[PDB]
Symmetry: D2
Subunit: 116 residues, 4 copies
């Protein structure tokens, strides 16, 4: 599993559950092509987005649908999404964990990158 | 006046100076239209992006060009840029300050929405 | 002038107003001696804590009383307070701005060290 | 395991390994008594600090020795430590994960609290 997304709620001190996540990959014509998507689990994590084989070098965007998450909790947040844009595997395969920490008017995102 | 961007460097404990910032507005066909841009000052701030007249309700994206900032410092970064996407709302406070705190493998962004 | 504290609320996207802040200096017997204190202003800032003359090299602690802030808002918090401990250094820039970004179950703190 | 500490390096996008961690518990006379200590593993995590039985209600302080971590990497950071102070188990036993994200002039800390 070369790509994992983990989402935390800084208001409740909990995983952010059932958060929609969309991954895109930049095409040769510089447009964003759909790559993978899913929803975070009870642990706030989304596994199984891609495989080593599919996850080639490129520029990827992970869009985390934070607005819908907050609205379902009765909160009107500032951001539409949290977006994480990065070049992947440009020095060979790596394992990426994209973590996002959410508040209604602020988010943090951190990448933990390991060499298999 | 209605939109300010402030950028800080968490590695050096300093304003992030000479960071390119691009603002876009979402068009009717869901594309991103260039709206305003500039570079952060010696205080890490970018003022004068827009006017009350022009900054109407709609969806905006602020891209902060973090990769070029870290590359200039000789520090290997993760993200292509930091991306802040939000809906401007006339019902709320009149000033939007988008603050970004930068590290090579992590960034946070906070919206401070106030009435001058 | 040499020490400022700025506090922001990540839930409301606002300055954190009326937050108690206590500054201590480490004594020779390793105890914490009260040094200065105040409450954040309507801009979330606390100025005038100390003077260049008094702010000599040594170890300082800034405690930000976050629990009482969240309790006033009716929001259940995790931390008793946010605590920032550092050594003041004459070799470096002359102004220390301690910034704290607050959520109920998370806080960050950043030092911006500059020359006015 | 009711208490876990996890530490990440925001400069390298990696676990923070071999970081010293000291836990204290406030005594009846309002002094900080040593409670547990250890060092983070290769995964940046510290497990086994305490047991359900020992980890009674109280006010706890987790001190993470971040300065020594950065200095060993050749960096002179701002903070002496990252300190996390919280009341634990005051509504019955909980499981606490204390996470800290480190940069030379900034740190974040987040608590994830679960009901067993
Ligand atoms: C000018 C803005 C504040 O900008 N937001 C900041 C801000 C936001 C997130 C993390 C740190 C900071 C910070 C540090 C020093 C000075 C300002 C800020 C306001 O007061 O509304
Ligand atoms: C990528 C990380 C996964 O955990 N990352 C966390 C993580 C990352 C950024 C901010 C907070 C957290 C956090 C809080 C509680 C438990 C875990 C985390 C790893 O295992 O190395």
């Amino acid at each position: 599993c070369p790509l994992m997304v983990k989402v935390l709620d800084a208001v409740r001190g909990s995983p952010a559950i059932n958060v929609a996540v969309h991954v895109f990959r930049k095409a040769a014509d510089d447009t964003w092509e759909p790559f993978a998507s899913g929803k975070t689990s009870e642990s706030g994590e989304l596994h199984g987005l891609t495989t080593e084989e599919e996850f080639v070098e490129g520029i990827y965007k992970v869009e985390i649908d934070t607005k819908s998450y907050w609205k379902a909790l009765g909160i009107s947040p500032f951001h539409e999404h949290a977006e994480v844009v990065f070049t992947a595997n440009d020095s060979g395969p790596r394992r990426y964990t994209i973590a996002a920490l959410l508040s209604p008017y602020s988010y943090s995102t951190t990448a933990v990158v390991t060499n298999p």
